[PDB]
Write a protein that binds this ligand. Structure first.
Ligand SMILES: [Zn+2]
Ligand SMILES: [Zn+2]
Lengths: 113, 149, 97, 194, 42, 135, 246, 101
């Protein structure tokens, strides 16, 4: 299993949460909740709704360029399972989370100087 | 030539490349050394259907999907592979060159700590702010009196 | 005259009367049949219903379509603090029960 | 006599992967008409003297209302015994990671974020049961051993949990833990205010 | 369809109870009784 | 053998008798009007209904005139009523659509426009062989 | 070496299996009979992986690959991807692609040297095919069908196409691919060749309803067994084919 | 004014999306598939008068030209100038990327 992200608002989409719209061109749209789903069906732009991660990234209120954001990606080339690699990966995620939190706090203080 | 005859000529026609060349085939060497499977042979290879029949039959036998995993260490074949950690996908962070990138991150971190990136920083200003807050409270009380009146 | 189109009756007559239960705590009408060759054990316990949540299960059900796949299922959580044993009741068999 | 004055934990009576029976009194609905009490078909719109009714409670002899005819009355708060409920987990109250699995390494407890709605927090040993049971929240539940030896493969199956949801049930909760919520949210105004 | 009260279905279920579910339930009962006996003798 | 396929998990049925759905193939029909659903049971006043993967009996209201005079078996491949799969995903398509088949499940047409559901693709191998996108 | 088989009484073998020169992928079923057919033919010479793609069993039409690589669609989960990676040796490159037309087994048909694709596939997908599979890529249609992987079966030895393919189309496609091509059917007159059968350089598995003349055609065009060649079709078996398919 | 505003959000009343309209403007093949999913004899003006930005058919050339001066067409132009929301923008909003080797 895995955590998806909402198409509309960018929140974590855990299993059995929200709803998926299957479009006839072959594109799937995952929504975390009926709020995002109904705004999508009303054709509201997420970039203009101020409560979404799309708006926040467009307005520059999210940390966008940072080295700690380059570690998570959709891996389309699988790696053979290795126990030591998985354990050191877990340690890496913990360390990366701490560093990212510190840098985010610095970014916010620079916004509110 | 009628339609039915034309379709049967199309079915018997064999197209060939015009240059006369042939592609290289890739048949492994053990194929000719393989012995053909025979059901009546007492020394036949034991099949997965035979194992399933010996272990309860179809719908009862539970197949082991990790039996044919090829790993660097065979003791890892039955591990519980982590997937979720603190609201994050482990598979999103799996990267063969993870140690170099983590070391680069730590070098950048200590460089920023030396440069003071994380370094954090007046009673007259406090007094004027407290006086402004008092004035705002007085204004709110005056507006409430007007609303009552 | 006969009913023109058949239909089964609404509701089960096995659960009559549809009255309020005579007690708030549920009553064990029947305990499992006792086998003296088994070791001694308790047949029941009490708890308090706390709510429901969602799980993901790695299904091992041979023959099923969802075999070797992940399934999302609803569950109920029952808060179970330990019970305290404070008594012992003896029962005899009579021609009245 | 040896068990006198002693605490008996739930895992000395029941075990994970066991199918048990649950006995409880159901949710009360008060006085309810035949449409919701018995599932009868509604009469057509603006039927005289009401449409949430049964049109003929008697068309035939005897000159009595029979006991098998649907009538309005008490619905719910009935005693029910429901059988064959699989135990998915027996969590221990002293385990700080009793909602953690082998593939989810988040150290978390069973209680959802913000608590169980109208219950509180589960701080003791708990039983996870597949599906639903007759009671409501706060209600005393009686768990019983099954009266007969089981005949299904589902009672023989061993359960392998990958993930347990712990997001808030007071809304559309998207965060399993408070740390996850803060990490997604970022720094707030009150954080610098504090 | 054979009903739940059918004789053949009862015989099938009796064979299942005797040969398959019975040993599993017996081993689980042994474990649970040992734990509760340890509590009783503590 | 009748048209109802085996091994199908329960889903929300979105198309009762009387529904008009799109024809997702190139047989010449533009829409399909459902008149019966294969495998439907007996209940007083209940309209028979099918979901994605079900075989229905349909008539053609818009399309080639040669297809108008017959009752064709069809398989529903897309529905707009949301339904849940066993992985907890509630999902829906933006239209209701099906394809004309024979009783053996083989298609009358030669191509499918748009995606098909996983249920229809898994239950009918010819539809799976003629699908470009499976969602 | 053409073997008749069924997957749960279905003759559409290519729907449920993917066969290359270096590996085999079979759908996970409720029994081991379909796996055991492939196991009886390939006795551990190449690995056989029991696989699920996107929670479905139609893995022959969802996947595409050759002896060098394997391509899986975007809805393949991380765990299915991990199982495939652990089952196959490191000589085979596996990639999940973001192609909109996600039925890869229907939109791609490939031997070890060349691949024919759906004409509307994206350029990035075409580059990924040419990289991972290590082949030349051409956008083609077989008998006006855009689903080349379901209307054609291909090996390094030869190819079998839709029975209504014109002779000039067969000649052009045979010059394009470099292998001999024959128009024929599988499964008692079905034109869905890729859905009906799987093939590699030394083995073919067809459905149980495949008749003896079309099985002989398959063996001749794919050079399976001793003394098997495509010239037998228009020399030795010509009378049989004319009698059977008139 | 919207005709039958009560059922406007039903799936059977759905309209073409802005990112699909963007792909239609960029690629004529995408627009050709979308027009192939319709019947030309049932379209206004036999399908000869079409506004791609609004994804709408009109009865005549004068009707199409007159529609271009209205504010709905100008709102569609402003939305296309701002750019449609896509899965790529959604991924960039959370800082997630695709690793293809
Ligand atoms: Zn959302
Ligand atoms: Zn316009």
């Amino acid at each position: 299993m895995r955590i998806e992200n909402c198409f509309f608002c960018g929140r974590p989409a855990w299993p059995s949460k929200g709803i998926t719209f299957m479009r006839n061109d072959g594109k799937a749209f995952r929504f975390c909740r009926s709020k995002c789903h109904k705004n999508f069906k009303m054709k509201r732009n997420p970039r203009k709704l101020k409560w979404t991660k799309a708006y926040r990234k467009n307005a520059g209120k999210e940390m966008v360029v940072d080295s700690t954001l380059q570690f998570a990606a959709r891996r389309n080339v699988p790696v053979r399972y290795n126990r030591e690699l998985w354990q050191k990966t877990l340690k890496a995620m913990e360390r990366i989370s701490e560093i990212r939190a510190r840098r985010e706090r610095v970014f916010y203080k620079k916004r509110m100087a | 030539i009628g339609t039915r005859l034309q379709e049967v000529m199309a079915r018997i026609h064999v197209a060939t490349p015009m240059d006369g060349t042939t592609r290289e085939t890739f048949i492994p060497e053990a194929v000719k050394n393989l012995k053909k499977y025979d059901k009546n042979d007492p020394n036949r290879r034991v099949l997965a259907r035979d194992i399933e029949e010996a272990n309860g039959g179809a719908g009862v036998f539970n197949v082991d999907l990790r039996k044919d995993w090829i790993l660097e260490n065979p003791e890892w074949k039955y591990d519980k592979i982590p997937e979720i950690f603190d609201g994050k996908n482990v598979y999103d962070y799996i990267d063969p060159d993870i140690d170099a990138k983590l070391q680069a991150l730590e070098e950048e971190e200590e460089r920023l700590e030396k440069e003071g990136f994380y370094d954090e920083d007046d009673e007259e200003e406090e007094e004027i702010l407290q006086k402004a807050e008092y004035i705002r409270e007085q204004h709110a009380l005056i507006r409430n009196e007007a609303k009552m009146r | 005259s006969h009913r023109k189109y058949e239909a089964p009756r609404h509701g089960s007559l096995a659960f009559l009367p549809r009255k309020r239960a005579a007690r708030h705590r549920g009553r064990v009408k029947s305990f499992p049949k006792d086998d003296p060759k088994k070791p001694v054990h308790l047949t029941a316990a009490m708890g308090y219903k706390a709510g429901m949540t969602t799980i993901v299960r790695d299904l091992d059900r041979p023959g099923a379509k969802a075999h070797k796949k992940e399934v999302v299922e609803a569950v109920t959580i029952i808060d179970c603090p330990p019970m305290v044993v404070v008594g012992l009741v003896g029962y005899i068999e009579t021609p009245r029960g | 006599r040896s068990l006198f004055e002693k605490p008996v934990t739930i895992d000395t009576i029941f075990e994970k992967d066991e199918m048990i029976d649950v006995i409880a009194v159901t949710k009360g609905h008060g006085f309810v008409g035949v449409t919701a009490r018995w599932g009868t078909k509604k009469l057509p719109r603006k039927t005289h003297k009401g449409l949430r009714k049964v049109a003929c409670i008697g068309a035939w002899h005897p000159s009595h209302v029979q006991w098998t005819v649907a009538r309005a009355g008490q619905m719910g708060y009935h005693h029910r015994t429901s059988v064959n409920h699989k135990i998915y987990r027996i969590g221990k109250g002293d385990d700080e990671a009793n909602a953690s699995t082998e593939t989810d390494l988040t150290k978390k407890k069973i209680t959802p974020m913000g608590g169980f709605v109208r219950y509180g927090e589960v701080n003791n040993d708990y039983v996870m049961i597949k599906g639903s049971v007759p009671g409501v929240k706060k209600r005393i539940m009686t768990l019983r051993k099954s009266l007969f030896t089981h005949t299904s493969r589902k009672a023989l199956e061993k359960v392998e949990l990958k993930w347990i949801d712990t997001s808030s049930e007071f809304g559309h909760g998207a965060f399993q833990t408070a740390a996850e919520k803060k990490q997604f949210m970022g720094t707030l105004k009150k954080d610098l205010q504090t | 369809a054979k009903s739940a009260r059918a004789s053949r279905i009862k015989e099938n279920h009796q064979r299942f109870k005797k040969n398959i579910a019975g040993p599993v339930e017996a081993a689980r009962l042994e474990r649970l009784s040992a734990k509760l006996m340890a509590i009783a003798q503590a | 053998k009748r048209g109802a396929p085996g091994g199908k998990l329960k889903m929300t049925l979105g198309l009762p008798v009387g529904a008009i759905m799109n024809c997702a193939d190139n047989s010449g029909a533009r829409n399909l009007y459902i008149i019966a659903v294969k495998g439907a049971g007996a209940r007083l006043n209940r309209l028979p209904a099918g979901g994605v993967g079900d075989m229905v009996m349909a008539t053609v209201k818009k399309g080639k005139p040669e297809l108008r005079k017959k009752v064709h078996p069809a398989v529903i491949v897309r529905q707009a009523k949301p339904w849940k799969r066993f992985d907890g995903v509630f999902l829906y398509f933006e239209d209701n659509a099906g394809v004309i088949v024979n009783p053996k499940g083989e298609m009358k047409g030669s191509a499918i426009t748009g995606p098909v559901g996983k249920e229809a693709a898994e239950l009918w191998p010819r539809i799976a062989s003629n699908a470009g996108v499976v969602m | 070496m053409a073997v008749r088989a069924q997957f749960e009484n279905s003759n559409e073998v290519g729907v449920f299996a993917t066969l290359t020169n270096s590996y085999c992928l079979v759908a996970l079923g409720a029994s081991e009979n379909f796996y055991s057919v492939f196991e009886a033919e390939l006795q551990d010479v190449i690995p056989i992986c029991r696989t699920t793609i996107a929670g479905t069993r139609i893995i022959g039409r969802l996947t595409a690959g050759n002896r060098k690589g394997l391509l899986v669609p975007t809805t393949t989960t991380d765990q299915e991807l991990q199982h495939l990676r652990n089952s196959l040796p490191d000589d085979i490159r596996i990639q999940r692609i973001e192609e909109r037309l996600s039925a890869l087994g229907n939109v791609i048909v490939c031997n070890d040297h060349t691949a024919l694709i759906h004409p509307d596939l994206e350029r990035e997908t075409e580059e990924i095919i040419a990289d991972v599979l290590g082949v030349e890529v051409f956008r083609q249609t077989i008998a006006d069908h855009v689903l080349v992987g379901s209307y054609m079966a291909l090996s390094n030895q030869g190819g079998l196409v839709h029975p209504k393919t014109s002779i000039q189309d067969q000649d052009e496609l045979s010059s394009l691919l470099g292998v001999p091509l024959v128009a024929g059917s599988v499964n008692r007159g079905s034109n869905v060749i890729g859905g009906g059968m799987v093939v590699n350089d030394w083995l073919a598995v067809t459905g149980l309803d495949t008749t003896a003349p079309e099985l002989s055609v398959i063996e001749s065009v794919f050079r399976l067994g001793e003394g098997a060649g495509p010239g037998a079709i228009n020399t030795s078996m010509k009378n049989t084919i004319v009698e059977s398919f008139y | 004014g919207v005709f039958a505003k009560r059922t406007m959000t039903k799936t059977r009343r759905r309209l073409r999306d802005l990112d699909q309209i963007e792909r239609d403007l960029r690629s004529p093949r995408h627009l050709q598939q979308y027009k192939e999913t319709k019947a030309a004899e049932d379209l206004p003006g036999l399908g000869l008068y079409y506004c791609i930005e609004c994804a709408k058919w009109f009865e005549s050339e004068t009707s199409l030209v007159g529609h271009r001066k209205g504010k709905p067409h100008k709102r569609r132009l402003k939305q296309l100038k701002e750019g449609a929301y896509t899965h790529e923008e959604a991924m960039a909003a959370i800082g997630y990327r695709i690793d293809n080797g």
